[model samples]
Target chain A: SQVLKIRRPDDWHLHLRDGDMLKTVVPYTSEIYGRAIVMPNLAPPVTTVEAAVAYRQRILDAVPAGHDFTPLMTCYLTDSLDPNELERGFNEGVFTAAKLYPANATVNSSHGVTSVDAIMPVLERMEKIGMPLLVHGEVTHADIDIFDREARFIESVMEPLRQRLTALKVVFEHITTKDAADYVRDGNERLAATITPQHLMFNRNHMLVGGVRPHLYCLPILKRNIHQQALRELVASGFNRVFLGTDSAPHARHRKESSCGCAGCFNAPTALGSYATVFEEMNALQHFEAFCSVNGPQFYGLPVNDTFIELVREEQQVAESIALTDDTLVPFLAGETVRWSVK
Target chain B: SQVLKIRRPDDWHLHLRDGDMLKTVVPYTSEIYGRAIVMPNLAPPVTTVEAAVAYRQRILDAVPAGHDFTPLMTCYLTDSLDPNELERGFNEGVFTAAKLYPANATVNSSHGVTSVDAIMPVLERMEKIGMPLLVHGEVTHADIDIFDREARFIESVMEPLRQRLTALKVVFEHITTKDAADYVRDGNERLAATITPQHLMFNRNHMLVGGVRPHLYCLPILKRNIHQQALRELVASGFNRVFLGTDSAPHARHRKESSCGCAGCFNAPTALGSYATVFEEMNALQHFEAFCSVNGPQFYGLPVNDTFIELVREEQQVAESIALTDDTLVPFLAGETVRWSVK
Candidate 1:
């Protein structure tokens, strides 16, 4: 009597690391999401077309048997990117999109793009080839305050770069502030953005305020209430182009609870439920399908998955932590309850 | 010579948690400070005059045999506070001041006062008797966002409460925001605030930016950059009554780096060095003595400490962590260098 179904969704942005981590987490996501635009900020990073092909096969091998999940690989942008390399990967369909991370912006981002200037040749090629550009939308300068980074990037970086190349399709990734959302609206048919469940579900207050919750800590660190309200407005109002991307990054429990804890909220295990919670809270449950499934494909110019999955309005508790041998991964909303459950 | 000389300071606010913890942390504060407003938020909080006396003796016993650190005790206010008991304790010099924690606001604050209305009788007595009131100036309500608790308190509670008891001497502990710094200045002569070194050195960025650093976390959590800039200005401009309070809360590292870390930065081991860094950065080194040594006693109507300490600016790295037998405590500025050090 109380069930909803959507085209089995896609995580426009996701992180499925190699080896044991890939084996441990792939099941949680593969059982639900039909496809994901996999990130490339690995330790050595997935910069080459050859690397992306091998990494994709590794991900396919790790996905639970009979689960029809697809990993859409991405290029990790660097200062000395070769335009010929980007064209070759896009033409062969080995790369669904290329990710631009400002150097040292977040975990594994040390090999990120030094500056937009450094990678303009690759950007021009991608723009010409009709390829989408996924962005980690914050500056990597220490002089820029962490809270102000996203807003500053919008002005000093994103805006100027957009002006320089009007046709470039940019998907601002895991945007955490009002500035990013505002910029994405009605600005250009070429510009879109991804909203992470952690950003929409909580603010800096969740990571800070009560205690330093390293679990909720992610780059483009969560902003204050007004910005969070703006994001809710963006999604609940059924704004098109902006879509779901779990940004479901996983890190071992030890690395996170250390003197210097890592930044990421492994939300894949409970992301759909968290999104449903926000949708239900905003009285926008009807619009959830578009944000979670339809909008992403429309922006990417791909056919939406014909398959469907059901979510029942039921109570579910997020596990405190998920263990993989010696290390553990604490999912977002861990030890907390969500109102919806996937069946 | 790059050196700073000031009268031996007193920690206007400090936390020496009961028995073994008292023995473990008192020396760190005593080695440098002459006196400290020992917090009353113990497990079963120091609610009675008898309890205050016993706690003071335990703290004295913990002080390294010859270190002359005096522990100024206080009463933990609750809804059903007996005005007679408070008056008796103050008159006998057993209780230094009464602490008000808006119920469940922080560590061991379960028995904190629910509302000012519930304790008006006690507050009225304190206001009249010249007994200063120390307050944890943040409201604890699940509905209110954590980062907003302090600012919300000023508008919803502090201003109204101050209006009701105009002559009340209130020390808003560990002021962290521009809202707080501005409120303490020209707000009232009877109103003052204590600033911690962690607040001076870091914003929310240091705690939540590159990593979720638990050691820099504390109540009225570190704010954004603009707020930190405001606090620096308030001290640099030679604001009369703002003074030093370590709020040097200590928790064993296990409890801190756990799934849910407790709130409080254990900064006692290097409070002087940390504060010196701020004063030097603000070029307000001359006013450092007033903030550290003079202003507190002037406000409390006690004589300043006759002793002094020397700080030499040099390249020195803070210890990574402090040991406490079965567990450990991570010192503030841990593994980070404080440009100034006690000579």
Candidate 2:
């Protein structure tokens, strides 16, 4: 009934590929997101201060000449990470946070930290330096079921790490399950999580319900309906622990639809639109601003963005798949006309 | 500290693979577990009454004659499942419960029920017949993160199914996350969950900590440490909803060590020993009976076994690998000597 409007949200997590992909997708994100934490999971991953600086410059170059959008870079954590170097990056303002990826996590994360314990020195330095650690929180245990990896990672690593490094600022990025949301909510004030649009909207069944829709694929896959409900409850509870991180990872059509399709979803184009739709479905519009805008800034100790964007639910058909030159690109929930459009 | 003796426990969820693997591993499970629910994720799965009966008979034939062990059977759900057939199986006492695998789940479950909505008839019949539904709570959505699939599945399928079939008995099998434990606890009195020994001991990092130990892998992989904390809390909370379902699916040493090892841990030989280890670690020995011996029977409307075997936490080195003939079988927690051991 009422047209909803809020401050332009900052995407707590985002993956703007690079080069052409970056140029193509930056507008979609910048149009709706005032700022976003650019993920460091590239080919070799953005591991060093110099690499992060260079990546951030490329992102800055990709932004449409004079857009007010900012891309906050993150250092990719590895077992060999130097605390002094990390502190240097943080102090020099090369990046806002450091990402901890367990080795062999979804997509290009082989260079991720091998063990949470091994990275204690880095975490200690971050804690001392007031730099936040963003975690891609899935354990790479071959014995653990793929579905159970994230929950297990939280149980075996995140909690213990949190306890051991009480002063360390941590953000559980793109948290999907209800347990994750609840645990993040229960975490210390320095700990928080970013809920993705995909996690909130879709469950596991959406992938194979009609057929194998590979384009809708991504890491930290959708959970069960019960989990979705839990997420709804967390958002409804108005808990500041939860915030928005689209994780709008994009892969070209060839990469997505091929025999071994890459895992990702291009939601940067309509990330906010889809999230608005989910909130509306759950009747959680009242709590939307806190999730999409307020929590992330609060957790990161940054000032909230001042601009506002209006979300209007009008009948509109988005392209099923758009062309990224030779190879086509498909966004999440493609070909469907959504109930809401963010402007 | 008194060395707490280990008692024989019943596994509510376990998948003893068919044919050669089954023949070799049945004795290992029989050696420790007094009873176990043999999962129905075979090639065709154990969907039909006749199939379940045949499979159960195979297991029975495999058990050494005087072992006094029992293998509980379950009906595999599919869209084409017949209510009358389900009732017939229940009436005949062939199956104690039904398994609802959302199609394409971990391992061999491509034929699992494609749509949750499509199984209303079967669920309704199970509700009427008082049969428990063991669920692999994960959505198959490609976009959903592996960690979030369970929570999403619970929200999307389990909750709605609960609403529709109010009387349907449900078991959230192999629950790995805090959200899952919490959800099962809050679910109807008819709802319960099986906690696995692997979930208690390892997180996702365990799989990749050294060099990707394949034998330690299983479906619904390990969750984060926070989730482990939640599970410890749930088990200690005296909530009847939490119980033992080892989901002790076993894969041979060769299968596990291969380049693409099958997803399962051969914990049958060490399930009880591992459970004891987890309980002792959590200081939850007092509640071990409910999780190990009491909960399964309570959920299935059966009586707990009269006899109890003892276990002790004496310093002992269990063989890193058990000899299943020549190939050798690697236990879940291989190489490590645990504080507790089943007598």
Candidate 3:
């Protein structure tokens, strides 16, 4: 638990939002991760290849001097998704994958796909073209319970989608339930999953028990201890189907702490450290590289980082919050100590 | 839908905290409720008969100019609970019931009963004397998941406590789960429960879904929709074992929306309107009066209010917040429209 080194990591799921927030948040991810599967659910969303390209340039511009990072672009799926447009992006090497955010499921998901049938052609095309379909596994109906949304999605949406398009590549992104963990585990190699540091290290109780913690809240929101334990053990078992996707979203402190606060943990600043703690706690530090580096790249069919990053096992207090124009973003492990830090 | 009349109700449970807060929050209850089973988990708690009387007097003094609301005092059962004190309070008519808050189960429950065994003597005494034990039916342990606490409490604490004191009048306070609902319904007449309109109308989703809504957060904590549905069905079934209890404990808006927000919904202002919405939604208006007024008094062995309250199916808005000297308590249903109003 002292010195640890791994292939410079790839974050398979992330949100490097646009503009000023982009400039402030990107450095944290770029500093540690070699490439991040950039989330497409921005304000207007990155539905087209043009938007993804433009957003990629902005993220690249945000990276600090001497930092090398690639923002792997994904298309945001909506009802109007054209199979040709998806194909054009994939054929042009611009779209890494496409995302499905069941309409209004999480932040800026208002433009998300209304129903799978609306974009069945796109999914079928992705299956044909061998491109991945990354999904926010929670359903977005008001009637459905938040905690049960992930499992419900698998039953009502994912299973059916997978059944119809048998060979489609799907990443059940940032799963927070045991059902999702088990589903992806048993799924064909065509199916894979990404787990976040927040989900791995904590449960719903972490947000709910002592206080209603807005910072720990996220879509496919953290489940109870049993689910947390399941996800942790699945990752610990060196499961190739599961890999690092730090769903490390950043939202202003005001937006988070105010009335009707938004859901998403800003863990980018401490994702590695926070995740390292979970890996160490599980006594599976040996598999840490596979989860953070090897598995993600292998699942994405991309090259692992030739570069390596060092993690020093020394306790350090994470900054309580990162300041940005008129508002602040509270990082995960805010005001908490982490056992590891990138050296 | 314009006129809905229900018997003048008794709040089977409520918390009117001391001095300033008591003065600020009492009016909302006094205006609508004929009597409220005043909770005893105040600072240092109302453990003795003398403390109950003093607190009752302060509440009476704080009652609005013309509203004649009776505050029925209760004892707080701590580890050192004296059976003699409980018996004396019951005989003297100062204590209508006693509350058992499993050590730190909720706000101001620092002196709560650590274990049921620690209070077997007092519980036995209450059983023989026909004195009730209002239970905050949740276990407080660092590892116990928040959602699982209530169900676990029943399995580990309540069942054994009830078995040991079979005839003890136990009112499971502010029940937030299906297990508690089913438990009370299937149990003997000696067992009863109190439901908050918030619990009946909303689930954990309301507090958690769109944002971390601190206003809707409460202990036993607003459970999942499944439990919310069960409690609603139980109430709609017009189960005689359940009654209205707004557990409308108030905290400043600042306190509720903080890093570790406090529990308890300040629902007193909109309790009746909120409850009416539930009855109207359930289409169980006929059973509303029984659940709101009759069930509580009959179980407590007291007479129902002679007068009736007229509720008009008129739309009105709940105040966003109630002001105090320095801080404001956000009223339940704050900034929300209610279909019913006290006429």
What is the number of backbone collisions in each predicted candidate, taken in the order shown?
Answer: 0, 66, 0
Model 1 alpha-carbon drift over 4 Å, by segment: B1-3, B103-110
Ten residues in a row with the worst lDDT in model 2 chain B? Answer: B102-111
**Candidate 2 residue-wise lDDT at B130:** 82
Tell me the tens digit of each residue's lDDT in model 1 across A1-343.
3788887899999988888998899888899988999999887999999999999999999887899999999999899989899889999999999999998888898888888998888899989999999988887677667888889988999999999988999999888788888889857788998998888888766666556678877787888878998999999988887999998899999888887788888899999988988998999998999998999999999889899999998888889889987889888888888889998
- The DockQ of predicted model 2 stands at 0.03
Put down candidate 3 lDDT per residue, B244-263, tens digits, no spaces.
89888888888888767888
RMSD of each: 2.2, 11.9, 2.3
Span of ten consecutive residues with least summed lDDT in model 2 chain A:
A207-216
- Reference-based TM-score of each model: 0.95, 0.54, 0.95
Runs in model 3 lying further than 4 Å from the true structure: A103-110
TM-score of 1: 0.95
Error of 1 at B69 (Å): 2.0
Q: Which candidate is the best by lDDT?
A: 1
Model 2: per-residue Cα lDDT over A1-343, one tens digit each: 4478898889989999888888888888877788999989998788888988888888888888557899999888889988888899889988799988888877787788889878888888998888998998998766666667789888899988888888888888887787797797777788888877777777765653333455555778666777877887777777878888888888876666532456777887777877887777777788889889998999888999998889887866878777686677777777778777864
lDDT of 2 by residue, B1-343 (tens): 4555334577888888777778888887787678888888788777788899899988888887778789888888877677888889889988888887755533332366667776778788888878888888888666666667788887788888888788888888888888888788777788888888778877765543332345555667666677877887788777876888777676666665432356677777677777777776777778887788887788788788777777776766767777765577777666777776766
Per-residue lDDT over B237-287 for candidate 1, one digit per residue giving the tens place of the 0 to 100 score: 888789999999998998788666788889898888888889888988889
DockQ for all models: 0.62, 0.03, 0.71
